[model samples]
Target: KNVKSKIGSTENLKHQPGGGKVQIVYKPVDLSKVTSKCGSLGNIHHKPGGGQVEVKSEKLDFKDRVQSKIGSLDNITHVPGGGNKKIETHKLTF
Candidate 1:
């Protein structure tokens, strides 16, 4: 016999400084047949069937890169009362 348990969806709202808020919704999803290859600055390919493949690359400071990238967008407009405000979602996958 086999049994499984899963948690339900959840919603959260975090208020940032300068009258800004971020709403995050957590939900369960399926990822059974998805294949992905991630690295710092290189290429990778997945073989048939499920197996572990380790690929090493050049040692670079990722945190510094991220901080630099974020620092570039410091003067962006962010306010609640702006007319026709646009929602841009930047996905940062680790």
Candidate 2:
């Protein structure tokens, strides 16, 4: 049974400096479905299957990873029209 792992980090109070504490969580991914066949004629065939699809996982740093990176909150402002904005840009002074 082949095993794999991953690492992650997180920090609070973003304004602070220096590398903050990191929490690393490791777990087994569903890779057993991956199979390959080899023959004496030097031919190989694989029964292709889906990759690691994580579902309902409370073991890894799912939320923290997104929150620290792109998914993090940038600005919480109330825009007019209750955020009903459809943007369409036209060519510049053609």
Candidate 3:
């Protein structure tokens, strides 16, 4: 009973210059559709309906760039708006 829309659109434009950026994005779906160094995720699945719990653990590629990245948000999900999310760091940015 759901529809597939655009995900990771912000991830496309997060960092301003280079690497060291970490953050999280919530779902229309799961999985990082980008390169690791550009950014990845520390995936936290709020999905309680049980489909892909495997998405809970993620492999965030440490480095950053592309476009305007999402910084931080906790406890959220898309309604007419959307949900909350987070990310990890090694080359973390804000």
Candidate 4:
């Protein structure tokens, strides 16, 4: 018995103005496999690149695809069409 249906609509593609190409799709629930106690579970705090990237999914506009900038603060948790995901990257120290 499973019933999940959210994510009204979404659309966001960045890396443009000189770059373009971003696609992501998923289908497979039952999450909870995040085991990284003190190293890498989502580590990319800050290095040389920018920061701020939060994307949960329940839909409901989902930011028309997902793009951020002004006062950066993103969170889209309306899962009902995908499973799980986490992409936190903002470190490139050299």
The TM-score obtained by model 3 is 0.17
Which candidate comes out best when scored by lDDT?
3
Q: Give the Cα lDDT of each candidate.
A: 0.44, 0.46, 0.50, 0.48
lDDT of 3 by residue, 1-94 (tens): 6666664455345553443444645455556544458666786655446344323334555574656566655444454434644643344448
Q: Write model 1 residue lDDT over 1-94, tens digit each, in one string.
A: 5554433323343454333454545454546564556735455455545445444444544331222123344333444443765666554658
- Report the C-alpha displacement of residue 27, candidate 4, in angstroms: 46
Sort the candidates on lDDT, descending order.
Answer: 3, 4, 2, 1
Distance from true position, residue 63, model 4, in Å? 30
**In candidate 4, what are the lDDT values of residues 36-85, reduced to their tens digit?**
66665556444344445544444343234465345533454455555668
**Candidate 4 weakest ten by summed lDDT:** 56-65
Which pairs of residues have clashing backbones in candidate 2? none
- The order by descending TM-score is 3, 2, 1, 4
- Cα-based TM-score, every candidate: 0.14, 0.16, 0.17, 0.13
Off by over 4 Å in 1: 1-19, 31-94
Q: What is the lDDT of residue 28 in candidate 4?
A: 43
Higher-lDDT candidate of 2 and 3 = 3
